[PDB]
Amino acid sequence: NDNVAWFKQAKYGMMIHWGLYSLLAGEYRGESSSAYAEWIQSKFQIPNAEYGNLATAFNPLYFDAKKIVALAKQCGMQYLVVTTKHHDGFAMYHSKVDAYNVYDATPFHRDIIGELAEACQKAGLKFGLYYSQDLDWHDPNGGGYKSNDVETAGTTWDNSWDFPDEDQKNFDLCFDNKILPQIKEIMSNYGDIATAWFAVPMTLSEAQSQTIYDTVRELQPNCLINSRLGNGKYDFVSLGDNEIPKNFKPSPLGLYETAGTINDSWGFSYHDQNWKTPRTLYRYKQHLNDFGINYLLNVGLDPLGRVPMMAEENLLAAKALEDEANRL
Amino acid sequence: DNVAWFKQAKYGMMIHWGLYSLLAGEYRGESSSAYAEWIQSKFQIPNAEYGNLATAFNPLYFDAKKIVALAKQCGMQYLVVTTKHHDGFAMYHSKVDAYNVYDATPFHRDIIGELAEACQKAGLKFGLYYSQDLDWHDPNGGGYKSNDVETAGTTWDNSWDFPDEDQKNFDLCFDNKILPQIKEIMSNYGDIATAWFAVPMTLSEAQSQTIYDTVRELQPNCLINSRLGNGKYDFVSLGDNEIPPSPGLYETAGTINDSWGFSYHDQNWKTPRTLYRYKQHLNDFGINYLLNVGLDPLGRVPMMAEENLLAAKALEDEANRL
Amino acid sequence: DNVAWFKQAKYGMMIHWGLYSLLAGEYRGESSSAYAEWIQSKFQIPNAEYGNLATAFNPLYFDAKKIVALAKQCGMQYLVVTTKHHDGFAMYHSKVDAYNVYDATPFHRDIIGELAEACQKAGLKFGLYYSQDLDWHDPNGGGYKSNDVETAGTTWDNSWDFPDEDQKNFDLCFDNKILPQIKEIMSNYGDIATAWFAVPMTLSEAQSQTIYDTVRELQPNCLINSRLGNGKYDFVSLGDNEIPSPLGLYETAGTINDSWGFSYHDQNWKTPRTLYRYKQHLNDFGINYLLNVGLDPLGRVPMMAEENLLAAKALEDEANRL
Amino acid sequence: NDNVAWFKQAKYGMMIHWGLYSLLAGEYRGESSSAYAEWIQSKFQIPNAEYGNLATAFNPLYFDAKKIVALAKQCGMQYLVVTTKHHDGFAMYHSKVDAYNVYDATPFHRDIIGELAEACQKAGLKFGLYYSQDLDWHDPNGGGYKSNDVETAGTTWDNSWDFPDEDQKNFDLCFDNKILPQIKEIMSNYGDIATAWFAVPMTLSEAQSQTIYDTVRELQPNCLINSRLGNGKYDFVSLGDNEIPKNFKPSPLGLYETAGTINDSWGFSYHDQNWKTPRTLYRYKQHLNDFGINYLLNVGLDPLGRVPMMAEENLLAAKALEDEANRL
Ligand SMILES: C[C@@H]1O[C@@H](Oc2ccc([N+](=O)[O-])cc2)[C@@H](O)[C@H](O)[C@@H]1O
Ligand SMILES: C[C@@H]1O[C@@H](Oc2ccc([N+](=O)[O-])cc2)[C@@H](O)[C@H](O)[C@@H]1O
Ligand SMILES: C[C@@H]1O[C@@H](Oc2ccc([N+](=O)[O-])cc2)[C@@H](O)[C@H](O)[C@@H]1O
Ligand SMILES: C[C@@H]1O[C@@H](Oc2ccc([N+](=O)[O-])cc2)[C@@H](O)[C@H](O)[C@@H]1O
């Protein structure tokens, strides 16, 4: 598995959060999301009927996988990691199992993950996938209904508004009929997958976690799995901000990654213009890299499928700083 | 009789909304000027590509009733909407031109009609803005004689899809689009209190008289702004730099940030106190404040615009009890 | 009677002001954390250099009367000032330590004395904040046992001028500076309604009891916040994360931007509506809102803080007539 | 005069606005200056007695000419131009003729212009001077009392509050007793002066302009004089924004300069965080340079004598962009 050597020297990856949440852009009926605009459905308890209707308005005329991959490559990013399905349960690929997806439900009627997979394959960039294996707000038995004594970036971890009957919920039904089928689809279509990125599990049993692990192993032997799946079921450690060294979980292969966003939201938010400066981005990358940690830097695409102007500017200027610094 | 009402109106909402709103001040990694609604001229976007934005126009949250409720809660007594801006895209159902919000967009609804009705019901007067000179969708759109002066885009006219300047002839555009479209908006959509025209550059004296007489005939009580032509108006539109003939009616238009059209990158919202003080200064001088909102791609008043309007009203009411 | 008064006070102004204010969130081309007042720890600025800021402290526009006028106009019934923060610089005339605003600065005036008088005259209650544990100017300042937890600076203690951790001894600092200074502020400056202590880390249970008894003796009617020590307080200081004590007295402290001390780079001012709604939510739960202002180097309430406080009050009054 | 050849290839200069205005930082009694914070005295008609008292609070502990010149040089700036005296009439050098200066009136009790002159001399950077030869709000006969049919960045062009009797004013008294003496001082002390930068004249006679021209010529033979002095009395043209070429006043030596600021104020302003991005700064510089026009980019020092953090970041990132570009 050359992927271990490659990942230890990759240093830099682009992450992409994009979905129906992007159309609301951090705002609902005159009121603000939390820092996390992608959590807006939970934040305002938007019924599935209304939220899902955003699919009818999803027509990102300027989306261009080739150009997004070109930007990542120009910044020295060696891989890319996209939301296949976030907490809202809306798939960004053509899902045989669930018609609640970007291909079937939207006038755009295209496979975002497929286009990025191809663009990456052509450019020489590795391709990785993010799936919300626990939380799913579209599913009556979506996870997080046992976790609501801890506050969130929305209201509840689960969809507790369309599905109020907590005691009647049963994650097994959602796992068996949606999660595992969808994981099999994304790990089967879309070619070689370098990296698999799972959410923080809360509802999943040890059994259900082992299943996902074995499934990925079988379908994508050379895929590196992040630590957020389950203990002993990963190839690299995802470090939270509170876990970076100054200037735990064992790492058997010596592989590490911290994910960040350029402003304070993962999803696009009109109101969030708090973009980290080129120098902040470059310095943070250099500090992680010096500690043998990969920087996975999020872009939140806008409703027309564009990298925000200020995100693009700050990525390119951080690269100019880095290249200047690395001569001498 | 609208003369008495207009002298005491004090406060109006203006609305800029169109295909420009979907691009939201940004095109291929670059910024519009302060005026996001000028973005097509700014980047010389071909009509084929720009017009295609119509296919993506589906503002799920647009709600005329709620927009008029906000205006009325702020003490605004009237509302003035873009029926067609410089891009030449009509925001009503135009018999004359299929390049409109009803025929060209999946939303497939008449924005002006809905606002007209909401206004009528709420007791708010209704006014219309039409670009009678500039039209970037029309081969003979105006501004092809005016390009020795800089703009909020590139050229005043569409000089990219229509490069042959000397072969242009505004009469064809005036006769076949401008005057027909003015007749439609002044015929459908009920009583019109206010008619708001752009800065004329190409229009002849004749063409200006025609528009004046047309509005007079179709909408006898409609007050016409000074930007049409000298001696062809009922009230003066003052620029900020002009606050000191009027046969005694006056209006200054402003926007809450620095753009008329919606712009993601422009978060330079004037504070409640700025909005209230400016209103009080204009009002004290017998001048109406026409305050622009630029609706977002889902048809929403931006959160910060709504907050600042409501807080300015709270300041004004507090002040007016002292 | 202070118990009854505090349960119905609802609203207080807090003030963070010191040498930190002159650096204003910036040191040698780099940013403080969100907490600009922690800047000395953040950059490990030696006492010799940091203390030299005293030579530049000349806030020509400081005006206790006007600051109290603003607080009173916003319905604030009390005021709470930093007498000495973590940097160990007293903002009153301290007999015990020459490292104070009177002796060390050209301004050569007693900030706490002026505010005490302005409050007394306006009918506003007066409260004092003292850092009883951390003191970065003192060789035996607290926090040298707490550095396995990260801070808004580097270390909790001054570990740069005073590196030898194992040789430090908080008793020397407590006996010779903390308790003397607490006695001064609780003796001069008249009746004290409220005593606001920092989160203790180094203090013994004994040292906490001493402060409690000292305040009780010198200022019998002073209400003491919960941050002193368990069973040694009259009201609970709640963090936001602690909203769903025997006298039923509660207070949550907040700042208008994200810093307690003034920071030129921090323009993230909470909107009037955010401020008003948060106040209303705390008040509905029987919790007092203590809202921080961070005075600028000339002793001014920042323009945007003043605007947002006044607009929040206008929203509140409008709402409370509905 | 090698200065003509040198100026045609200089491309890039730092400008500095700094004075009592800097302490008020765009704010007075709860209210905002215009975009131009340095005009704040006119904006609020602050009496000379109160405004001048700011001198007592002027103690910029962090001012460091050596470091400011280091920054300019790191950004490829080949010269530096400082306010010796702006419209407020407060000199930033030790003036024999007027005690209303940074040396005599302030506890800092040092010569800003002298320190920068020396730092520049040592670093190999040319040194230029800005003097307000017309407007002077401290002087009873300061200019602009004939010009108040045009609006300003303050209230009136002249100090019309301390000196209300417009018809009794006489600029000759101010010119003879302050302007020309002060110009002689700055052109005599402070070594070789590469560039002389005058304000837009409104009150000055043709005679008074000729005098300044001849004075500079005699005292500083190789000093290049900007066009804002008087027609036929200049070596290079100062172009206003509205005069830059696309996709007048003749220039006999073919010398051109446009001055700009990084935010929207020349003087420091707390409230103005509208910093032009690295890419804006670099692109504008490249466009001017391609047209043989020098870019004179203003920094407005803060009350402690610091280059604002975001101004320093944007200058350095613009340089990184420029160097990256110039290797492509
Ligand atoms: C990448 C993000 O992950 C989760 O929330 C977290 C969980 C862990 C961290 N972390 O510590 O880096 C940050 C956000 C999601 O809830 C969020 O919407 C986004 O997808
Ligand atoms: C209401 C605005 O008017 C026009 O442009 C202007 C705006 C103001 C003036 N004025 O008053 O100077 C002149 C042209 C339009 O170009 C702009 O997009 C918007 O429609
Ligand atoms: C009022 C603030 O108090 C402390 O910081 C804290 C410490 C603990 C909490 N808390 O846990 O509620 C809040 C602020 C100080 O560090 C800070 O400078 C400011 O004075
Ligand atoms: C460098 C600047 O010069 C003047 O302001 C200007 C500058 C340029 C023009 N111009 O070209 O129109 C008008 C006023 C001064 O008023 C300002 O404070 C600063 O010193």
DSSP character string of A222-260: TPEEBTTS-TTS-SBEE--GGGSPP-----TT--EEEEE
Label each residue of B31-76 as H, E or C: ECCCCHHHHHHHHCCCHHHHHHHHHHCCCCCCCHHHHHHHHHHCCC
**A24, A51, A304, A313: which to substitute to probe chain B, counting the most B Cβ within 10 Å?**
A304
What gap in Å lies between CA D100 and CA D94, rounded to an integer? Answer: 9
| D274 interfacial to chain B (CB closer than 8 Å) | yes
Coil, strand or helix at C60? coil
- Chain D residues whose beta carbon lies within 8 Å of the beta carbon of residue C60: 53-54, 56-57
Cβ neighbours around D222 below 10 Å, total:
14
The secondary structure of A142-171 as a DSSP string is -S-TT-TTS--SSS-SS--SS---GGG--H
* D323/A279 Cβ within 8 A: no
The residue contributing the CA closest to ligand 4 atom 14 is D200
- The closest-lying atom of ligand 4 relative to the alpha carbon of residue D298 is 1
Q: Do residues A45 and A74 make contact, with C-beta atoms less than 8 angstroms apart?
A: no
- Chain A residues whose beta carbon lies within 8 Å of the beta carbon of residue D278: 278, 313, 317, 320
Backbone torsion region of residue C281, taken as left when φ is above 0, otherwise alpha when ψ lies between -120 and 50, otherwise beta = alpha
Cα separation values, B6 from A92, A184, B1, B2, B214, Å: 53, 67, 9, 6, 21
**D59, D74, D314: which to substitute to probe chain C, counting the most C Cβ within 10 Å?**
D59
Give the type of residue at D120. Answer: C
What gap in Å lies between CA A90 and CA A178, rounded to an integer? Answer: 11
* Backbone angles phi and psi of C103, in degrees to 5: -85, -35
The secondary structure of B223-264 as a DSSP string is EEBTTS-TTS-SBEE--GGG-------EEEEEESSS-SS--T
Q: Do residues D210 and D231 make contact, with C-beta atoms less than 8 angstroms apart?
A: no
In which domain, by residue range, is C37 found? 1-322
List, comma-separated, the residues after which chain A is broken, a break being a C to N distance over 2.5 A; otherwise answer none.
Answer: 247
* D306/C22 Cβ within 8 A: no
- Spatial CA neighbour of B144 closest among B130, B152, B155, B153: B155
Q: Do residues B243 and B253 make contact, with C-beta atoms less than 8 angstroms apart?
A: no
Number of domains in chain A: 1
* CB-based burial label for C121 (10 Å; 0-12, 13-18, 19+): exposed
Q: Do residues B250 and B287 make contact, with C-beta atoms less than 8 angstroms apart?
A: yes
Rg (CA), chain D: 19
Task: Give A288's contacts (C-beta < 8 A, 6+ positions apart).
Answer: A244, A258, A294, A295
Tokens (6 digits) for A300: 């939140």
* B307/C311 Cβ within 8 A: no
Which residue has tokens 């391609």? D290
Tokens (6 digits) for D261: 């600021």
Q: Do residues A27 and A43 make contact, with C-beta atoms less than 8 angstroms apart?
A: no
What gap in Å lies between CA D175 and CA D142, rounded to an integer? Answer: 8
- Spatial CA neighbour of D325 closest among D282, D273, D262: D282
Which ranges of A14-138 would DSSP assign to H, the alpha helix? Answer: 21-24, 40-44, 48-52, 65-74, 102-105, 112-123
| A313 interfacial to chain D (CB closer than 8 Å) | yes
What gap in Å lies between CA C307 and CA B274, rounded to an integer? Answer: 10
What letter would DSSP give residue D325? H
- Spatial CA neighbour of B155 closest among B40, B281, B317: B40
Cβ neighbours around A292 below 10 Å, total:
14
**D31-32 and D27-28: which strand pairing?**
antiparallel
Cβ neighbours around D109 below 10 Å, total:
12
Q: Do residues B221 and B191 make contact, with C-beta atoms less than 8 angstroms apart?
A: yes
Verify whether ligand 3 is closer than 6 Å to residue C243 (CB atom). Answer: no
- Spatial CA neighbour of C132 closest among C231, C209, C55: C209
- Chain A residues whose beta carbon lies within 8 Å of the beta carbon of residue B58: 56-57, 59
Give the type of residue at A22. Answer: S
What gap in Å lies between CA A297 and CA A275, rounded to an integer? Answer: 12
d(CA B186, nearest CA chain A) in Å? 32
Q: Do residues C127 and C193 make contact, with C-beta atoms less than 8 angstroms apart?
A: yes
What approach was used to elucidate this structure?
X-ray
What gap in Å lies between CA D19 and CA D83, rounded to an integer? Answer: 8
Tokens (6 digits) for B31: 């910024």
Q: Give resolution, Å, one decimal.
A: 2.6
Give the type of residue at C95. Answer: K
* A32/B52 Cβ within 8 A: no
Pick the ligand that lies closest to the CA of residue D132. 4
| D316 interfacial to chain C (CB closer than 8 Å) | no
Label each residue of B196-224 as H, E or C: EECCCCCCCHHHHHHHHHHHHHHCCCCEE
- Chain C residues whose beta carbon lies within 8 Å of the beta carbon of residue B317: 314, 318
Coil, strand or helix at D242? helix
**How many Cα atoms sit within 13 Å of D55 on the Cβ side?**
21
Q: Do residues D214 and D187 make contact, with C-beta atoms less than 8 angstroms apart?
A: no
What gap in Å lies between CA C297 and CA C5, rounded to an integer? Answer: 34
What gap in Å lies between CA C65 and CA C121, rounded to an integer? Answer: 9
The residue contributing the CA closest to ligand 2 atom 2 is B260
Which residue has tokens 């700042």? C255
| C167 interfacial to chain B (CB closer than 8 Å) | no
Q: Do residues A55 and A105 make contact, with C-beta atoms less than 8 angstroms apart?
A: yes
- The closest-lying atom of ligand 2 relative to the alpha carbon of residue B292 is 1
Give the type of residue at D21. Answer: Y
| A34 interfacial to chain B (CB closer than 8 Å) | no
* CB-based burial label for D23 (10 Å; 0-12, 13-18, 19+): buried
Cα separation values, D232 from C68, D213, D223, Å: 59, 10, 15
| A30 interfacial to chain B (CB closer than 8 Å) | yes
* B29/A312 Cβ within 8 A: yes
- The closest-lying atom of ligand 4 relative to the alpha carbon of residue D130 is 20
Tokens (6 digits) for C173: 């600092």
* CA dihedral for D15, D19, D21, D23, sign (positive or negative): positive
